[PDB]
Structure formats: C-alpha cells, structure tokens
Write a protein that binds this ligand. Structure first.
Ligand SMILES: *[C@@H]1O[C@H](CO)[C@@H](O[C@@H]2O[C@H](CO)[C@@H](O)[C@H](O)[C@H]2NC(C)=O)[C@H](O)[C@H]1NC(C)=O
Ligand SMILES: *[C@@H]1O[C@H](CO)[C@@H](O[C@@H]2O[C@H](CO)[C@@H](O)[C@H](O)[C@H]2NC(C)=O)[C@H](O)[C@H]1NC(C)=O
Ligand SMILES: *[C@@H]1O[C@H](CO)[C@@H](O[C@@H]2O[C@H](CO)[C@@H](O)[C@H](O)[C@H]2NC(C)=O)[C@H](O)[C@H]1NC(C)=O
Ligand SMILES: *[C@@H]1O[C@H](CO)[C@@H](O[C@@H]2O[C@H](CO)[C@@H](O)[C@H](O)[C@H]2NC(C)=O)[C@H](O)[C@H]1NC(C)=O
Lengths: 126, 354, 107, 354, 354, 354, 126, 107
C-alpha cells in the first residue's frame, strides 16, 4: 500500500491563485524527497523542484524559481505546489514523485535519486 | 596526575541497557558522545538549536545529568567535534567556520591552544565520537572533502593541546569520515568509519601508535554496517569491492573488548536497511576485519524497529582496575536527541531494548 | 546547465524487434546517474532504469540500458505491445534533475 | 580511603522528626530510600513518571535537596533498586528488563560491573532500601517469584561491584521480599521483610556475615507489622503460624540501635490495618524476634491517620564517631512521593508527627 | 582542621552596603541570618511558605546565591533556628513541634545529635541569629515562655553537636528572646536581646565563656533599640527601669568591633518608633551598656524610611587574618524577605542606603 | 598557593572565534568581562536589570556557563566594577553609592576589605575590564570626573584586598576612563583607555610596576580606536593633538602577546565610525604606541557590520605553562548582552565572525 | 454510612448509546476495585469486569471484552458502565460491587477478593 | 477457563432442616477462593462466605461452608424463613471472577 495520491483537476482564471496537493502513504514521509514534475500534454516532463518534508528544505529548477512555491506539511503527510499569480501556460499535468531512497540532513549531499513512485497527476487548466 | 593508557577490559560476554538520558520527556542537541577520564564521564553533544551554523556549540554535562541549559557547559563554538581525557586534563576538539574554509580548534583544560586548517577546502569534519589518548598522545581522526565524492582523512596526534604530528593513512582512502575509534591494544587504534558515497562497507582504519602510521581497508564482513545497505553478503567481488546502496551513511558504534588472549570487536547497526530505525549489536572475536568475510554474530536488539536509531558511538568507562566498553545510541526525536547507553556487563544474552 | 537530447525521437519498430533509444548529454553525467522512464498514454511515467543501468524493482529483463560519459542508451531486447510508450531519460545526479524531450516508440 | 564497618549507635532513646522533603508543594518519584557514606547522605528514588516500565530510573540527590530534574543524577535504568556505600565508593543496584526475564545490574562508582539473572523467571526484585556493607562486602537482598504464590529470596555478597557469593537462606522461605536490612552487630545483618501473600507477620532474616549463611523465620510478636493486618495478637498457633489478612503488604521501616550491652530494634507500621495511612514507631529492646511474642512498645505517631504512610525504610547517618539510626517514610500524594525522615535523637517521647 | 576562636576585627571605622539578595525581583523565606566558617558564608533562613507550622524548614544557600528551591538545602524541620561553624564542621539548630511542647534539635554535619526539651511549656525559641563558637564550644541562646508575660532565657553550650552544659543567667531575666550575640573578647559573649512585653530597652547579656556564667541587665542608653519606642531618653528612673511602649518588639543587629585596646559596639535600629520601617546604624565605643546612659552615635541610614526594616542580625566574615563585623537586614516584601548586608569597611561616613 | 606573575604568551599569530555565550536565545546583564586564575575563568558582568541604580550588582559564573539567576553569584552591590585573581584568591572590585559621592569597595575572597572614596566628587568609575596582579600586587585603574569635561584617572595598588598605594599618572591626563589593561612585560602594565570628550585617540597608559609610576599619552596611530571617529589618519598635528568626533566613546579590547623578543599589541575596534556596530581586530608588533603613527594592521572581522559591537575587553587564559591572550565582545541585544570570545590560537587568518 | 448508590433505571432503543453509574461513599474509593455484575432476571449473576479507580486499571471477563466499557472518575467518587451500540439482550439488572479489601499497584497481583458491598442495581431495558 | 456448576439447583427443605448446597469447580480452585452469596428476591446479593469458608461480617453462625479442591459446599445449619434465597458460588481468586448458575432454596 505505497502511494502518492493527488487531487483530481482544477480550472482557473488568469491571476486566480492556486494550490494543489499530494498525499503520501505507505512510507516514512519526513525522510524522502518529493518532487514536482510538469507536463504540458504535447511536451515531455519538466522537473520543477523537490522538497524534503521533515525540515521543508527545497530546491527549484532555475526556470521555476520564483514562479512556483513548493511546500509540505508532514503533519498530514502531504506535499503542495502553489501559485500566487496563476497565469495561463500553467495548462499542464502536474505530478508528484518520490525519490527511491531516504535522505537525512547529515548526508550533506543533493539526493542523486530517480523518482520511484509517482502520483496519478493533477490536471490544471490555465 | 598520571597519563592514561588503555587497559584490559572488564569481564563479561554481553551488553545490557545501562542508562537512558531523555531530556524531552520531563536544550536541543545532536550527535552526542561520551568520553571518560579516570573518575569522570561526560556526555558531550553539539547544540543543534536553542532550548552547520554560527551558533552551534560543543557542550557537556556529567553523564547521568539531563543536558539542560543550566547544567550544560559550553566549551567552544563548533559544528563538529570530539573530546577525550589524557589522564591529566580534558581535551576538547571542535570545528567551526565556513563550509569551504573550516578550522579545527583545540582546547586543553580551560585554554585554547592549536588549530588546524582545512586541507581540501570542503567541510572539515572530525570524528563525532570521543578521541583516544595513550601516554598523553591523543589521536584524533579528521577529514576534509566532499559529502559526495572524494574525502580523504588524516589523523592528528595531539599532545597537551598541541598538534605535534599529521598522520596520513594509506590504503583505500577515497572516502572516510565520522570514525568511531578505540584501542585494540597498547600499539593499535582501530576505527570503524563512515563512507558516505561509495559503499555500505565501513572503512576500517588500523593506526599504529608506536610508529604513527595508518592503513585503511574496507571491512570484508558479509554483514554490512552502514545504514543504506545491500542485503547482507550481497556485495560480490574481493573484500575491497564497493557495493550498491553506498550513497548516504551513518556513524556506527564500535568498541573493543581487550582480553589477555583475544580482542572482541563489538559493532552496532540499524535494524532497517534504508531508514535510521532500530539498533542491534553485533560481535566478532578475533580475526581480521580487513580479510575475514565471516558475518558478525548477532548479540541482540538495542533499539526496536519502531524507535529511531540514528548515530551510535563507542566509549569506555574506567572501572578502577579495568575498562568497560560501552556503545551509546542517539535517539533523535521530533530534532533533539536522547542518549541510550548499553555497556558490557555480565554474561548471557542482551535481554531488552530501549 | 545539463541538457539531455534524447533521440531519434520516434521509433517505428514492430513487436519482436529490438529497440534502441539514445540519450546524449551536453556534458558528462557524473557517476552515470542517468535514469529512464516509461510513459504510457494517459498516465504518470514508470521508472525503468536508475544509475546508468540498474533495473528498477518490478521491471522485466527486457529493459537493460548500458551507457557512460555522455552517451547512454535504453535497450528493449524485444518489443511487446505493452512497451509501446514514450520513453524519457533523466539526469538524477547531485544537481537539479532534468529530463530529455522523450522518444516515442510506435509499431 | 577505609572500609566501612557498623559502629555503635549514638545515644538517645527516642526519635524525632528530622526533615521533610516535599517537592510538590513549591519529578515524579516513588519508593525513596536513603543511604549514607562517611560524610554524605543520598536520597535515592525510582522515577515513576517524568516531571515497571522501560523508562524508570534509579536517581539520586544529596539528602536535603529537593529531587528536581536539574538536581537529580540518573544512575541507571531500573524499575527496582538499592544503593550503599562501602567506605570507599558508591554501589548502585538496579533491576530492569522483562517481568519474566529481569536482570540485576550493579554499578560501582561510575562503571557498570556485574549482573545477576532472574532465577524463578518472575519479576526479580531487590530490597528497595539501602544495602549493607561491612569491610567492603555489601549484602544485598534479592527475590524472584510470584506476587501471589512462592517467592524465595537470596542474598548477594557484592565486593567492589562484583558478585562474589550467592547466599541461600534456610528456614521459612516461601515468600520474602522488600527487606529492610541493617547490622545488629559486626557479625549479623537482620532484615524485616514483606510477605505479600501468606501472612501479616514479617519474615525476619538473620544473616551471618562471618559465615555467609542465613535463616528466615516469621517475627513472633503480637503486633503485626505489615499493612493488611489481623487485629494485634489475633493470629493463633506457634510463632511460625501464618495468619489472616496476608494478601498484600508494604515495606516497613527497621533500624537497629547498637548499644554496648543491648540491641534496640525500631520498627515502623501504618496506623490503619487495611489502608496505607499514617505511620507509627514501635520498639523492642533485646529479645529474639523469632521467638518473643511480646508486643512491641509504642513510641509514637510519625504520620497521622489523615496523611499517607506507604513505604518506609531504615538507614543510618554516620555521625563522625557513632551511627544515628533513622526511619524514613514515603508519603505518596496525588503518584509522586515526599520523604519524611525521623531520626533517633535525644530522649523523652516522640513529640510530633508529619 | 582547627577550632575557631574570635579574632581582632579588620580595620575600618564605618559600614558600607555590601550586598543585596532580593529573590523576588527576577521560595518564600523569613528571618534570614548569616553565619560564616573559615572560608564560607551561608545565608540561612526559615521557609515561611513554599515557592509556626509543620512545614517550616531551616534552609541555606551560599551567601551570594539567590535562595531558590533548586539552590537551597533543607537542613531540618524548624519553625525557629540558628546555625554556626566551629572551625571544623557546621552546627545547625532548629526548633519544631507543638507550641506548648516544642523541641530543639541539633544537627552536626550531616547527623542529628542532641535535642533539648521545652522548659516553660510555651513556645521554645532560639536566637534567630547565628550561634557563637570558641574552641569548639558553641553558645546558643534559647528561651521558653510567654509572648506576653515572663520568658526566661538560658544558654546552651554545645560541643560537636552535643549539649554539654545548661547556663542559667542571673540579673534581670523576666523576658529575653531573639538575642543577637557575638564575642566581645575571647572571654565574653555579649548579646543585644528582644523584650517583647516589658520595655523598649534591650536586655544585654554578658556571658562569660571561661566560667560559663551569665548576667542580664537592660541597656542603660538613652537611644532605645527595640521597634516600638519611647522617644529617646524619655524613660525615667535608673538604668533597669522599664519604660513605655514595651509591648511588641524586633530582633536588632549587633556586632562587635574588636580592637587591641577597644571594643566597638555596632547596633541597628528602625527609623520609625512604631512601625518596622527603615534601618539605621548606631555605634558606641567602649563603655558599659549596662550603666552608660550616653546615646549611641548615629553612623547612618542603612534602609530609608520608605523601605521595610524588620529583623536585623550581626555576623562576622573570616578575612584570612582578621574578622569583618557585618549587620544584615531582613527586608520583608508583600511575606518573603530580601537580605541587605552592610559590612565594616573603610572609613568616612556610611554613604548610601538600601 | 603561589602568586601569579605574567608569563610569555602561547604561540600563534592570529585569533579565532572561541566561544559565544548568548543567554537570550534559549538575567539582564551589561559590561561583561572575563578574568582568569591559574585554573579557572570567570565571566563577570554587572546586572543591568532583573531576569547606575541601587540594585545593580557585580555577578559571575564560570566561563562557559550561561549567566542565569540560578547559576550566578552576586559578589557585591556595584554599578561599576572589575575583578582579578592574584594566584591565591579572587579580588572583586565594585563602585556603588551616589553619582557625586561614590565609593569603591574591595572584596577579597569572601570578605569585604578596603574602600576608596570619590576624589572629584563625580561618578567614580573603575576599569570595567579585569584587573592586573603581579606578585600579589593588583593594579586597578579608577577614574573620577565629568562624562564631558575633565576626568583624571589614578591607579590603585591593591594587596590582599587592601589599598596600599595611590599612583598618580602624569602626561596627558585630562580625560581617561574605562581602561583595558594588561602586562606588556614583568615591569609594565599598559592600558588602552577611553576618552569620552576630547578625542577619538585612546589614551595609552604605561604603568611601571617596579617603581609604581605612570604616564599617559595618546596613541599616535592613524587608525583611531574609539567609536565616534575621524576617518583614519585625518587628525592633523603631532601625536598628542586632539581630533574631531571626540564626544562619546567606547571601551575597546586590548591584549598583549608577550614573545621572548617582541610585544604584540592586539586591539579591537567597531566597524562603524559612528555607531556601535561590528568589531574588527587590529595588530601592531613592537613600536611605541605613543610615537608610532603607523596604522595598525587589520587582522579581521570579529563581528559583522550587521551585528552589535559595543564594549570589548582583553583577558588572558592560563594555559598550564603559557598565557593565551583573548578579546571579548559585548553584543548588546534588545538591553542584555551576549559575550563573544576570540582567542589567539594557531596561525593563518581570522576566518569567521560572530 | 458505607454504600454504593446506583442510578434507577433506563430504557433504550437498539443502537442507542448508554451510560450508567455507581457512586461510592463511606470508603477510600481510589484504592478499592469496583466490579460490574450482570443479571438477566431469570438467570444467575455474571461477572463483567473490574476497575481500580485510582489509575483506572481495568479487567474484563473475556465474554464482555469489547462489548462494554468500564471506567471511573475518582473526582466525584463514581464508577461507570458504558455501551456504544446498546443492542437488545442488555435487558439485565446491572450491579456494582466493591471488593472487601483495598489494593495498591505494588501488590502486583489480581485482587483475589469477594464483593463485600453491592449497590441496589440499575435496571436496564434493551 | 473456570466453570462452577452449582447444584442440585433446587432445594425443597422446610425451616428447621439443614441445607447443603454444592459447588463443583471444573478445575482446582487455587487457595480455596470460593465465595458464597445470598440473593433474596428483588435485591442485590449479600456476601456470606469468602475464602473457602471464612464468614463475612454481619453473617450469622448458621452459615459455615467447608470445602477444598474442586468440591465445596455451603451449609446452612438450620433453615429459617429469612434464608430462603437463591445462593450463588463465586471464584474470586487471582483470575476473572466467575459465578455459578445458583441454587434456589424453596420451603
Ligand atoms: C598497556 O601498558 C600499560 C603500561 O604502560 C599497562 O598498565 C600497567 O599494568 C600493570 C598491571 O599489569 C600495573 O602494575 C602498572 O602500574 C600499569 N602501568 C600504567 C602506566 O598504567 C596496561 O595494562 C597495558 N594495557 C593493555 C591493554 O595491554
Ligand atoms: C565493628 O568492628 C570494628 C573493627 O573492625 C570497630 O571499629 C573500631 O573501633 C575502635 C574503637 O572502639 C577504633 O579505635 C578502631 O579504629 C575502629 N576500627 C575500624 C576499622 O573502624 C567497630 O566499633 C565495631 N562495631 C560494633 C557495632 O561493635
Ligand atoms: C583569642 O585567642 C586566640 C588564641 O587562643 C588568638 O589567636 C592566635 O593569634 C596569634 C597572633 O596574635 C597566632 O599566631 C595564633 O596562631 C592564633 N591561635 C589560634 C588558635 O587561632 C586570637 O587572636 C585571640 N582573639 C582576640 C579577639 O583576642
Ligand atoms: C616574569 O617573572 C617570573 C619570575 O618572577 C617568570 O616566571 C618563571 O619562569 C621560569 C621559566 O622561565 C620558571 O622556572 C619559574 O618557576 C617561574 N617563576 C614564577 C614565580 O612563576 C615569568 O616567566 C616572567 N614573565 C615574563 C613575561 O617575562
């Protein structure tokens, strides 16, 4: 029973704020990094960033730095992707994915890990 | 009054829970260790937060005390450190400064003495466990290099707070850190180290304290001792072969039981092969860790799978006429830590966990 | 900083044929950390390969994928209807993960 | 520097309230006891909760201190325990582990030394009172058996933290526990024990420390000393006859007053015959507890009927040239406890309670 | 190591504020006093409440410490008490028990030793100031009688915790209590006492420590030293004449300045003639307090009229080679108290108050 | 046991952050300083408020302790003060009383000894840094005069708590205060002082301890060391010329590094020329501060511009065989202060700030 | 004046929750065990379980384990019997009874005691 | 685990007759902890006997009840109208207390 469960879909207006989420189950959530991956339906996958619930340590792809916010709350075993100014162009499928191995702060390295489990994806229009 | 030398260990065949220091159930600390002088044990830790930063300090309390702010003594600024007693006075070691230009500081008694500069211009680290003094000469493991990549270690010979010799180990030195060291005999200091990138097999250092030389080879044993692990005996090839799951790691426990005709080597390991949960105690008597593939015997569970294991360390208590090997465990809770102490005492089986 | 240009971008091989997919990195992939993923239409991608060539748990022997340096491939020893999907390569080293455009495998 | 031997007691004929330690009126502890070295008294207790579990510890403070978390020293994990001083160093005793596979641990000074394994595979218990050292040889009562059923005791002779001899008492041994022991003379340790199932008469142990032998018989006296009690002199038959109300029990106080030509035996008892309320002090001079049916004299009320009595213990304070027998009382409040100390001092009557 | 004897006082002609201990501005205590050994001063007080009852205790901290619960040591149950050091060990004195059947308890070092029983079957009281030891013989003033009516005092000679002699003063003994005592010379202990019913003139006790005899007469001086007072020089008749405003009273300060050819007598008094407000320091050199009507010289204000004065006491600090006379003041605030210490030091005028 | 004499300093060429005591991040104090005896360092401070007034006290804790109320010792009432150890016992100095009639008090060990009266009938002040003892003779700088106007200083020679000699410096004495003093050699005490009205150049005192004479001249160096400052080298005229921005000031750090053939003079300064922000370390080897205009070399930043600098002080740690010069910084936060310690240790550059 | 006082009677519907109680007086309530005994009017007595007010230590007859809840509150000197899903068949008289002797946790045995005092019984229909 | 089968289940004795009630335990009753209770119609039961045969406070001498092992009785030396009640036996040892069916004593 190992899974990432995402919200279904959203449709927004340009400028309308947006928050979507992933809930983890079946694993020790606070020690694995969860990443967000964007996919415009006719395009390939685009790594947007990762978060380490547990101390909410984040890393963003330079192209998404300042465009989106990645946050998490270990209290309810969830990860979030937020927009403040949802523009258009955010008409993409957004996926969470969890790294194959755990990481602890004292490892002192950037997790060189693949994404082992993926959520089903949240479709966001606009 | 007199210099400390390692002594033969106190008789016994197993370990038992000795003491648990758990300050949060009634100062936020991490990476605790214990070091003992002739008649005094101190519980050292680095502050993690207030009740790698500019505020982290090396602090201590008498072992048996709860490490509160009022009870603790702040020895020095340090994001990494160790301490030991040479039979006459306490030596405290700590590393502070920038990640790429860190500096080691040595304190002896109340005074600051020597320093050591980073050599690989990367985070300079010390063993986070207690240092080892023989005849006044304290041997400290330090390392400087990448968290992921090459990080060669060296040993410092410290005498009365001064660094007198730099020892440069040979052998397999690509990544060595966070070494738990102790005396195998009056001539040798052996260390069970972390390898945070290349393998789940701990580098095992053999330091000759009569010649001040060292050689490092991976432990050959089928039971792998780091936290991320292959499933026991699964790494193929010769003893030196690096295996899978080598990315990441943990500082483990390691003590010696010195008997007239034998050396016992007690090791600690997590219960989980991926997560820092639980702790168990393993032992091998005699042999050669660098060549002997034989699995370590399992003594027992120190911390159950349901409780955090995290870092462990070896230390010895000075029991008047003999030494008592002990392994401590850092139980991180949510990130302050409790310290569980298991000591060699008596015979029979380890009967219960923490 | 690292760009993965996965190619040819389209294969048109029948079931039973061997499929070779390539991923050229603009710079050396340290330690061989290039992963491969399989994306079936309508669903999130599955991890096939991690490290330069280690097989992910649950993945059949059909997928190998040896490679090094800047030049990596994914090899499907024999295509089956099950494996007609868009494949992606990913850099997963100690730096911001980055995927390639993806290669579509058609009948 | 020198080994402790029991000395003649300090002159006096009665007890007076000495000191009350009551931490809750300004760490949750139970089953306190006091043990004294040549120039130091320590107040020991087991933690019950935080300010039989895996978290209970044997802790102590200097007598006169309030047992706060900051002041307390955690000596060892222990759900049962005792401590004593041999004239050179402190010995701490504690029992931990599973109910049916418990283990005794011995700490000497700062080091863990010997252990002892359960023998009846039931809860291993120690006297919860201080242990008795003569010439370096510390005699500890331990017991292992059912709370309800047979629970035979044995004594351990501990020297410098090691268990050197196992003493197996004869006589009436079906159920003995929680023994309050002390020296009657340089040759004998006598103990007033609990019997938690068969009788309200305390087993009285006479341990010969020159021969390391022991015999247990019930006290013959008409005044019954356990908590559930028949109404004084109501148990018929010979001295060894078990009476009614034998289910349940309490650890009582017991000290000796050693005079050149006499041994005074001071005992404590609750005021209620069923509930653990109040405490009184009773005394008999000379005689033989195993044969003498004579009622103990009533000295006075230590704790009034309206206040909790619970466990009591004997200890002695080392007054430079002579020893001062004292009885402490555990006043459980709502379940932390306050410790009331009554000491032999002066003459006349006990004048007031706690 | 050696017995204490009084020494000549350290040179100086005036007092200055030394130290204020004020725990409430950051345990509720009353009637503080200070007693000093060869290299240690302790601040003693009775607990009044928790942070005449069954819970009041004699407690202490090192002088200079704030008397918190964690820092304090509880020496004994006591609603009245005193303490002193004989050069080898601390003697602690306290009174507990019923108002009409009170008992004095003596503690020496860690042990309880002698007791003393009430003799007038009324509240037994001790001097609330420190006791005076010469050559190991500690002289303690005790009193037993009515708060309003006759209350004769006696002195106890205490040696190594034992009461060896009862000294029965002659002269004017109808009501004497709460005596502030000190050495006038190696042969004499003089005390400035409270009279809580008959007069505003303090009884002045002259105790001969070579003969163990004492005589009490009222101070003859025109400046009256108790709290309720006639307006200075207003009591007519001979030195022994009782005056008006004799109902009620306060314990005052009193120290001696021992000079090779002179005895200075320093006294403290409140500023108000009716209320316990303010404190001033008065001095007379030489003379005879029992016959000399001369007004004491006014040195200065220690506590202003706007601040509480309440009880004061004399004590001496052992300055390596000489003694330093000091007067402490109990400043009761709302009823815990702060302790203000004024010590002889230097020359010139007392320059500021507390 | 033995009198302290200054010793040659421990080898090293630079300073590194040693320790930070920051009590507010987990008692409100100001103007901290550190003084060390043969085997003990104390962190002294004046209380500013509770956890120039009548309540301010000179307090201390062991260096390394957080200065909480429970840990602190209150030595004396004092709105200004200093302390030092003479090799046998601690001397504590404090000033209390009225602004225009202040008095210095000297405490030695536990006793109050001499006092000193104001001489200019203005606020009497002491150096707020530790005092300097050679052979038992402790040299204390005191000053009395206007905050704005003339304030001449003098030195007191204190022996075993007594003031034995008054030393009256010559030279340029119009305004000298808050002197950071230390031994340049066995014959000389040099001090870097504050001038709170006339100039940004510190008076530099050279006190001859063989002759008990002193002379004061302004430091001639182009780098000005007070807080309000002209922009380095901007004061024209001869070495003694007063410059601009002389109104206001700060106590700076100053230690000597005593080498067999050289004297190093380490000075501290703020980063800002007007506000008390940041701290830097400057050094000059050899020369003559009274004549040498050469700019001090910049060693490094101790406190960044973004953090408070405020007062600093010099002290030395007694490292068994040699002395370690250290400079402490008072980081005032909102007004309690944290104390940052930087000590000479090792070589290379100062690598990081506080 | 030693007594256990029970509530009078209750009548409930199947599924309707239920709480009944006993109040003790005349004894040191926190140190005695109080038991519940069921009696279907045409049947004998059936021990349901015991509680030790004082630390609320309970013991249940295996046949009532998970069927009923036994609880107590020493604050008001009372003992309680609760149902979550009152079925039918609970048409019985329910009695509290107190053990003849006190017990303390350190006795470490199961109270081998008879019931000395009984309440009058609470009749519960359904 | 312990079953008490109290019997005959009904007595039909007149006042003045001796009544013997039996309680057979399916297994040995350790330490003799078998209690007896008297239940009058319309009211909570009274404790008569505790331990194998100790008499409860307030109970008349009419009630004895010797027994051991598995075989225990309650003996009413003489019946009186007052004692026509249903009697119950109970195991009250260190295990879940358990009662018997009960024996009705009729005229
Ligand atoms: C290591 O060497 C030291 C000697 O340098 C050994 O210690 C001595 O042990 C003997 C008893 O066998 C004592 O009489 C000596 O007084 C001890 N000397 C010192 C300096 O302590 C020590 O036992 C050896 N340890 C091991 C592990 O072999
Ligand atoms: C128990 O025996 C010891 C001797 O082994 C007695 O202690 C001695 O007492 C004499 C005075 O009578 C002293 O001079 C000795 O120095 C003491 N020796 C030691 C080793 O302490 C002790 O008094 C005896 N106790 C009893 C109760 O009889
Ligand atoms: C009281 O008498 C003692 C002697 O019994 C005096 O103390 C001695 O003083 C001399 C110096 O004058 C020292 O050399 C001795 O060693 C001291 N002896 C002791 C036992 O302390 C003391 O000074 C006298 N005090 C007064 C007030 O006269
Ligand atoms: C100041 O003078 C003292 C002597 O009065 C010097 O201390 C001595 O140093 C020698 C080693 O060179 C030791 O053997 C002596 O035992 C020391 N004597 C004392 C009293 O400590 C000290 O080194 C000189 N300091 C400086 C800065 O020159």
């Amino acid at each position: 029973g190992l899974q990432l469960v995402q919200s279904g879909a959203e449709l927004k207006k340009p400028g309308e704020s947006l928050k979507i989420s992933c809930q983890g189950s079946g694993y020790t959530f606070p020690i694995y990094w969860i990443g967000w991956v964007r996919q415009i339906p006719g395009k390939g996958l685009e790594w947007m960033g990762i978060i380490y619930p547990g101390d909410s340590d984040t890393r963003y792809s330079p192209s998404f730095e300042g465009q989106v916010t990645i946050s998490a709350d270990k209290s309810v075993t969830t990860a979030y992707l937020q927009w403040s100014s949802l523009k258009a162009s955010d008409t993409a499928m957004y996926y969470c994915a969890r790294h194959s191995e755990p990481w602890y702060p004292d490892h002192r390295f950037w997790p060189p890990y693949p994404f082992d489990i993926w959520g089903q994806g949240t479709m966001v229009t606009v | 009054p007199e210099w400390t030398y390692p002594r033969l260990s106190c008789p016994g065949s197993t370990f038992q829970k000795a003491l648990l220091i758990s300050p949060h159930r009634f100062l936020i600390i991490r990476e605790p260790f214990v070091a003992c002088g002739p008649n005094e044990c101190k519980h050292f830790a680095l502050t993690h937060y207030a009740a790698r930063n500019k505020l982290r300090h090396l602090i201590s309390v008498k072992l048996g005390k709860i490490p509160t702010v009022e009870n603790s003594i702040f020895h020095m600024a340090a994001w990494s450190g160790s301490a030991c007693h040479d039979g006459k006075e306490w030596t405290y070691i700590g590393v502070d400064g920038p990640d790429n230009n860190a500096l080691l500081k040595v304190k002896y008694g109340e005074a600051y003495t020597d320093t050591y500069h980073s050599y690989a211009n990367n985070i300079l680290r010390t063993q986070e466990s207690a240092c080892n003094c023989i005849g006044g000469n304290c041997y400290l493991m330090i390392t400087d290099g990448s968290a992921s990549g090459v990080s060669e270690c060296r040993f410092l010979k410290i005498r009365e707070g001064r660094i007198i010799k730099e020892i440069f180990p040979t052998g397999r030195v690509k990544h060595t850190e966070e070494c738990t060291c102790g005396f195998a005999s009056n001539k040798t200091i052996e260390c069970a180290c972390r390898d945070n990138r290349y393998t789940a097999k701990r580098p095992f250092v053999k330091l000759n304290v009569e010649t001040d030389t060292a050689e490092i080879r991976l432990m050959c044993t089928d039971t792998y001792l780091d936290t991320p692990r292959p499933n026991d005996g699964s790494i193929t090839g010769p003893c030196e072969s690096d295996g899978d799951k080598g990315s990441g790691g943990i500082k483990g426990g390691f003590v010696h039981q010195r008997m007239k005709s034998k050396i016992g080597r007690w090791y600690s390991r997590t219960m989980s092969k991926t997560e820092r949960m639980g702790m168990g105690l393993y032992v091998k008597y005699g042999g050669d860790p660098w060549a002997d593939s034989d699995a370590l015997a399992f003594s027992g569970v120190m911390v159950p799978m349901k409780e955090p294991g995290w870092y462990s360390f070896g230390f010895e208590i000075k029991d008047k006429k003999c030494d008592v090997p002990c392994i401590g465990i850092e139980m991180v809770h949510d990130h302050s830590a409790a310290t569980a102490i298991y000591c060699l005492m008596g015979s029979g089986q380890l009967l219960w966990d923490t | 900083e690292i760009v993965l240009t996965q190619s040819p971008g389209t294969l048109s091989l029948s079931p039973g044929e061997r499929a070779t997919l390539s991923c050229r990195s603009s710079q050396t992939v340290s330690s061989g950390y290039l992963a491969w993923y399989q994306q079936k239409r309508g669903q999130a991608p599955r991890l096939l390969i991690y490290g330069a060539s280690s097989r992910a748990t649950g993945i059949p022997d059909r997928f190998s994928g040896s490679g090094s340096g800047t030049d990596f491939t994914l090899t499907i020893s024999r295509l089956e209807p099950e494996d007609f999907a868009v494949y992606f390569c990913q850099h997963h080293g100690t730096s911001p993960g980055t995927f390639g455009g993806g290669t579509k495998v058609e009948i």
